[PDB]
Design a protein around this ligand. Structure first.
Ligand SMILES: CCC1=C(C)/C(=C/C2=NC(=C\c3[nH]c(/C=C4\NC(=O)[C@H](C)[C@H]4CC)c(C)c3CCC(=O)O)/C(CCC(=O)O)=C2C)NC1=O
Ligand SMILES: CCC1=C(C)/C(=C/C2=NC(=C\c3[nH]c(/C=C4\NC(=O)[C@H](C)[C@H]4CC)c(C)c3CCC(=O)O)/C(CCC(=O)O)=C2C)NC1=O
Ligand SMILES: CCC1=C(C)/C(=C/C2=NC(=C\c3[nH]c(/C=C4\NC(=O)[C@H](C)[C@H]4CC)c(C)c3CCC(=O)O)/C(CCC(=O)O)=C2C)NC1=O
Ligand SMILES: CCC1=C(C)/C(=C/C2=NC(=C\c3[nH]c(/C=C4\NC(=O)[C@H](C)[C@H]4CC)c(C)c3CCC(=O)O)/C(CCC(=O)O)=C2C)NC1=O
Ligand SMILES: CCC1=C(C)/C(=C/C2=NC(=C\c3[nH]c(/C=C4\NC(=O)[C@H](C)[C@H]4CC)c(C)c3CCC(=O)O)/C(CCC(=O)O)=C2C)NC1=O
Ligand SMILES: CCC1=C(C)/C(=C/C2=NC(=C\c3[nH]c(/C=C4\NC(=O)[C@H](C)[C@H]4CC)c(C)c3CCC(=O)O)/C(CCC(=O)O)=C2C)NC1=O
Ligand SMILES: CCC1=C(C)/C(=C/C2=NC(=C\c3[nH]c(/C=C4\NC(=O)[C@H](C)[C@H]4CC)c(C)c3CCC(=O)O)/C(CCC(=O)O)=C2C)NC1=O
Ligand SMILES: CCC1=C(C)/C(=C/C2=NC(=C\c3[nH]c(/C=C4\NC(=O)[C@H](C)[C@H]4CC)c(C)c3CCC(=O)O)/C(CCC(=O)O)=C2C)NC1=O
Lengths: 161, 49, 160, 160, 160, 161, 161, 160, 161, 161, 160
């Protein structure tokens, strides 16, 4: 796993020279943006359950998937579906705070699409619901925080792929 | 003690891996033992001996 | 980063980042400017500090520099200096990052075995690091020296 | 099924089915027709039982039934009743099977998570199950009511 | 007992006795009288049953009782009859119990090791139990023979 | 563990003699009691949680033990107390159906007193709570069932103290 | 695992509807066949050793497999061959009691071909041995039990692939 | 304390406490003075804030106040208020400590199990805690309140 | 473990009342002492190996224990002596930095005397070495830090005594 | 770890002295009698099953111990009894080869009496069974080797009683 | 002893001593007289060999003898030589035993930690052991030197 500062440090280490001034400038800009990102992330954590419920209501509620045989039409299936959405949100929150989606791709997206395809869960349908959740979360978090949420949602779209 | 109460601390991601089949029971045990859950209940309070 | 280490702990807990941990991350965001300025000063004086530390290390371990020692000969001494400078650059990178763990992962893990393969004495390497730490404390500001001393202490523990 | 549970235990023991376990399966075969008759009665009176139990549940938990509760409005109450109907069908399937494991797979797994996601009150769901048990006692024979009551009691524990 | 086996399963499951498990316990309660009557018949005809079984077993495998055989001689033949009688008493206990639990703890755990140590032939012991099963079917009612035969059959399989 | 039938079988095996008339009537007593036992067990499972709640309300709730510094004055401590009471109740219901105290001796009452002592949890408080649970259980189960449940629960309480 | 009743329940759950009368008739047929199946399973357990002995002798006795270099020419391989054959017989017997082959296919037929490929055992020779065991088992059990046992053994033959 | 949590992590690592962890402890030493002023304000509004938040919570969940609810009657309502007051005191102690772990050990660990036994509704309790956070936002200065709201939110999340 | 602030919180919790202003003043005193303790703790970790070597020279070096048959006269025994001293130093450093001795009692003390008695290691010799380590640690840390670390070391020695 | 030669070495190590003439003589005696000990040990291993059979026949069989209620009445207890004698013989022969009685005390006699007392095994019956094994082992091994084996067998009996 | 080590392995495997292990014991006993004769010769010439090897080791590592080395001064050099003498006696014990286990128990278990604590140079200690091995090989007869060389080589490997 790699932090943003750690990624710059890794590039400098591979180069064999001390971290460049431009890389230092990028790190300083990351810190300045990180303050606002951290405040919004704390807000996201407080309303995480509400965000999950809103997305489920937007798509899953009163849906054919809820109807029997829809791959979420079981008590175990429903618990797993909600849990997967919440886990994606938590990993995305960590990625947004770090500024790098590498950790989310490394663990959350590592073969997740292949596993979901084997399970038969609809990856594209889940991605559409995740995009709706991302839009609502971005609106609540703010425009600047929505930009970070957009990066996490882009990683989610890659996970759909 | 009861065996009917896995309290909050349980690791659901480990459960998910085991259900999928990606994690064997042996690896499940190693992660559970390594986790801070096991440490807090056993390592830190009780002496190393 | 320090925030990254906190994030790893939070991921193991599988819960959102702790309130105090987030506050510490915000403090790190404020501290980044001081870290950058101190690191820039350290990089500017890095070569001079390396030369002074090398002279002090040679005084501490004349036998190592002399024949029958690890640094015996110009080539061996030059390799010793290159290792010292590489460790110094890694120390600067770790200080800039603010995470001792990144520096430990990059180097000083199994460093005793590496020194055994080279044949150099770990205590003599440690003394050279200590001389570099003293020079760095003088070069940096008092606030910067305090943080630099902590990074140097981690390096000293790795050396021992 | 009962055969499924017994065979699972025997497979774990890696032993051919014990004489007593085989006798249990034979008892299931003997009482299969009676169990099917009870299940058929439950399916036949399913709609009427649902209506009566719904009235009793609303009386027990007026706040949920009223606006400002989980079943706020006709649409929310109808969705709640549909979920209760799915429970009732699962209870009929379990009663026919003779083992509560199928019902546990249908509804018990993650039941707390589902109720929390909906926001609805688990205790009120349990009270509705109790009302269904009373109606089933009215519509079943005394021997049939006892077995149906036992399966419904497992359902009550699942609600908790 | 069958109740004992169900209790063991419930204790492992960390759950109260299943409704179907209680139903089998109820069946065991109902069949207590019939099982006791069958056991009384076996105990009443005990001497003749195992006497005929011993003759049949020695006829089937004459080397058990011949010179150089394990039971060669009157005293060892009587000891062989005692071992058969131990098994017969265990089968009567098991018929009363309604489960294999009584026999398994006595004569079905490690029995192969014990018989190998003494030198008696395990296959011949199994045939002796089979001869007992035939005699018991002759001396019992048809469905009584079926149940008693089932418990006997578990003993025979254990010897294998 | 043991049962009434299993214990009589054990005694007969110790004696080394086939089923006697005395053995027959001891077993027959268990056979007759079976109907009462199973009905009571179903009732106990149905009202198990309510039984625990009633017992602690009658004995230890709204007391100094619940008030700060009383070994039950925490969310975790309170949950643990309810858990141990449920453990005793479940094993006692098992043992009542079994008819023998071997199950309680083997599992319920093994080292429990020493562990309770070292923790500092009051043995007397547990004994009072167990008696209150016995009263509630006897009421729910019925008169004949209450007498048997009393015997099994009495074994647990006496072993604890 | 799965059973015949469980399979009917799974179909009804996928439908999301209460059991049909025709589905109930299918369940009634399973209940009718249960008595013969149970007695047959008891017979199979009693004569399991005899069945294994006869089938093994017909399949590979006095053969090149027993002869040196035949892959059953080691005592360990001989014992392991008997162990695998006994496991096949026992698991299939349990599936026969269930009336549904899904449990046998999931428990025993998952990865068996890959494991046997790594082992180097002749799957076709094992299939011939299993068919011979099916013939012997049908002879001992009877015609009615043999037909069901043959179907389960045919499922095992399909899993041999 | 945050230092205690860091020490636990270091003990698991079998290493002396990290220089970064020590710096974090120093940072909280700096934060403690402002936290103490905020805690003094919390103690000043110990009763008034409880009363205001309790009125809001009672409005949110009228059924609990209504007969047949958890807090039915004056005595039960007083007990509900006392539980809320104990949570508020725990929140103040946790805010002073800086580590939510002290609050978690005192309560919210197994609190759901306690609520299941007592009959208390977790949703209404969580809403009351949130209302307390809003009242506290008005009660305390925003810079101090932001951290305090996070501590209250941690309790709310554990409840949910 | 327990901390100084946690101990004040524990006393307030036992009382049941909110933290008093005077109790907060006690906590503020702990906060003031923490800064000096932290700087000294960093110094102690840096020179920990030298401190251990100095104490070992003070007592173990040129001693009958090191001489053959002295119970410190083995490669394993000498390594174990070094490891035990290091573990005591690590626990003591944690206790001094934390400012509460509860951690030392909780982990190091419990049955340390019993384990030493079972092993046959000389408790008095270890206590003398502990005093030597306290002197060296006080010298390296400073006078003010030596009082706190020395008090914790004296507490460990007092428990051993 | 302790062996005869190793124990001489260990005593010398405690002294720190170079090998004494007395130590050389004792080690030479071990070297000298190793041949007879080795041959007898091989014979014991070859006829181990016959020895335990003879021992139980001579001492533990055809009595109340194996009759009902005698702690061997059941097959489980009988299997454990012959297994216990087998372990006794195996570790005894280990120790007889080693030449030092210390090994058996380390493994065979560590807590053995306490374990047997707890389980209800007759200590005297075990001792007499060990003596019966001693007679049978002496017969098979021969007088010169059996006398050496008898000393270590008797040490096992002494530990039991 | 070699027989003792074989017995340890056999006990772990829960099997009586293997025929090959018994043959190892027989061979060791047959060669025991020569093994002890070689060991006695080593003990007889131990002091003179120690002096010669110490001079050779000081010649190879003058810096260690000189100030700034572990054996700085006569007293430090004497302690160094005493440790070497103890190792030599342990080597004699191992050669007599025929297994390296006695030497391993006496030393080389945690010996690296002891050397790190003292600061004495492990490579120099290893070279001193090698010098003693060369002198001892010259001193002993060819057959005895061959066995002594193997034991000394094991000691040298432990030193390295
Ligand atoms: C096969 C197992 C299974 C079950 C049971 C199940 C239930 C289930 N209950 C739901 C909602 C719900 N469940 C309730 C339940 C209740 N509200 C009350 O006041 C009462 C106390 C109570 C029932 C009597 C309500 C009100 C909703 C709608 C949530 C809302 O929109 O506010 C939903 C989401 C809406 C939908 O159906 O799309 C599902 C899927 N899903 C499953 O897969
Ligand atoms: C690193 C974090 C992490 C992720 C992301 C993860 C994914 C994940 N989701 C799973 C299951 C699942 N996921 C779903 C999800 C859905 N069903 C739907 O209809 C929706 C479209 C959708 C949710 C938005 C379902 C229904 C299952 C259960 C499948 C089953 O076994 O029956 C499983 C299978 C094992 C199990 O948990 O039972 C994995 C491994 N596991 C992880 O540890
Ligand atoms: C130190 C941590 C800790 C806590 C918090 C705690 C709470 C606690 N709350 C209780 C009661 C209660 N708690 C509630 C709670 C509520 N009812 C409502 O309507 C609201 C939604 C809600 C609060 C806002 C009620 C109604 C009772 C009384 C229950 C009864 O006896 O009927 C009781 C049982 C009575 C007693 O004290 O003996 C305890 C122990 N105990 C602890 O050790
Ligand atoms: C053999 C079966 C068995 C028993 C008996 C058992 C008891 C048991 N009770 C314990 C603690 C405890 N038990 C209680 C229980 C009570 N609190 C009260 O006010 C009452 C007087 C009482 C019972 C109603 C409490 C409060 C703790 C300590 C919880 C803690 O502070 O961490 C612990 C320590 C671990 C823990 O905290 O859970 C054990 C092992 N465990 C077992 O496996
Ligand atoms: C390389 C190791 C190895 C061994 C030893 C081995 C044994 C072995 N023994 C067999 C049969 C047999 N083994 C015996 C053995 C005996 N009957 C007696 O009366 C005597 C006491 C005893 C021998 C002295 C008999 C009679 C059969 C034939 C069984 C039959 O055909 O009905 C068979 C099956 C027939 C065949 O050879 O094809 C094998 C494979 N297989 C192996 O891979
Ligand atoms: C039975 C196994 C065993 C060994 C071997 C052992 C060694 C041992 N060596 C020591 C010291 C020492 N060891 C050396 C060793 C060396 N310096 C050199 O220049 C050379 C390269 C080298 C030897 C050839 C020195 C110089 C000291 C003294 C260090 C000091 O006190 O300043 C000490 C500490 C002082 C003391 O004896 O109390 C021990 C315990 N202890 C044991 O229990
Ligand atoms: C929580 C931290 C912690 C401590 C403190 C601890 C103590 C500890 N010390 C031990 C041994 C030991 N400790 C010593 C110590 C000494 N010998 C002397 O002559 C000196 C007087 C003294 C050192 C100052 C020795 C010699 C042994 C090994 C005993 C033996 O096998 O002979 C052992 C036995 C296991 C082992 O070999 O490590 C433990 C568990 N364990 C721990 O986990
Ligand atoms: C509760 C379980 C259990 C059983 C069954 C049991 C039986 C048992 N059978 C024995 C002997 C024996 N068992 C046999 C058995 C047989 N010989 C044959 O030819 C036949 C094929 C076969 C029986 C039908 C023989 C011959 C002996 C005497 C061995 C001898 O002394 O030579 C012995 C040893 C002598 C003694 O009684 O002290 C026991 C203990 N013990 C138990 O604890």
């Amino acid at each position: 796993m790699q932090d943003a500062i750690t990624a710059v440090i890794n590039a400098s280490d591979v180069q064999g020279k001390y971290l460049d001034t431009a890389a230092m400038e990028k790190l300083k800009a990351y810190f300045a943006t990180g303050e606002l990102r951290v405040r919004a992330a704390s807000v996201i954590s407080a309303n995480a359950a509400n965000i999950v419920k809103e997305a489920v209501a937007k798509s899953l509620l009163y849906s054919d998937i809820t109807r029997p045989g829809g791959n979420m039409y079981t008590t175990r299936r429903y618990a797993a579906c909600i849990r997967d959405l919440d886990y994606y949100l938590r990993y995305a929150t960590y990625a947004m705070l770090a500024g790098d989606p590498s950790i989310l791709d490394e663990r959350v997206l590592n073969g997740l699409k292949e596993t979901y395809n084997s399970l038969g869960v609809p990856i594209a349908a889940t991605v559409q619901a995740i995009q709706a959740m991302k839009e609502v979360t971005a609106s609540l978090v703010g425009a600047d925080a929505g930009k970070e949420m957009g990066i996490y949602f882009d990683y989610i779209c890659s996970g759909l792929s | 003690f009861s065996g009917q109460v896995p309290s909050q601390f349980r690791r659901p991601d480990l459960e998910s891996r085991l259900r999928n089949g990606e994690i064997t029971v042996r690896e499940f045990v190693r992660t559970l033992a390594s986790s801070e859950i096991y440490r807090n209940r056993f390592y830190t309070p009780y002496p190393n001996t | 980063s320090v925030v990254t280490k906190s994030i790893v702990n939070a991921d193991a807990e599988a819960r959102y980042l702790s309130p105090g941990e987030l506050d510490r991350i915000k403090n790190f965001v404020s501290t980044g400017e001081r870290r950058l300025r101190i690191a820039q000063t350290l990089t500017e004086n890095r070569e001079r500090i390396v030369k002074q530390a090398g002279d002090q290390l040679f005084q501490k371990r004349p036998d190592v520099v002399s024949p029958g020692g690890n640094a015996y000969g110009e080539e061996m001494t030059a390799t010793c200096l290159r290792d010292l400078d590489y460790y110094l650059r890694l120390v600067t990178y770790g200080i800039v990052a603010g995470d001792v763990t990144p520096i430990e992962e990059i180097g000083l893990v199994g460093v005793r075995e590496m020194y055994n393969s080279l044949g150099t004495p770990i205590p003599a390497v440690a003394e050279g690091i200590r001389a570099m730490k003293n020079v760095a404390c003088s070069l940096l500001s008092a606030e910067d020296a305090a943080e630099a001393g902590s990074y140097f202490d981690f390096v000293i523990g790795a050396m021992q």
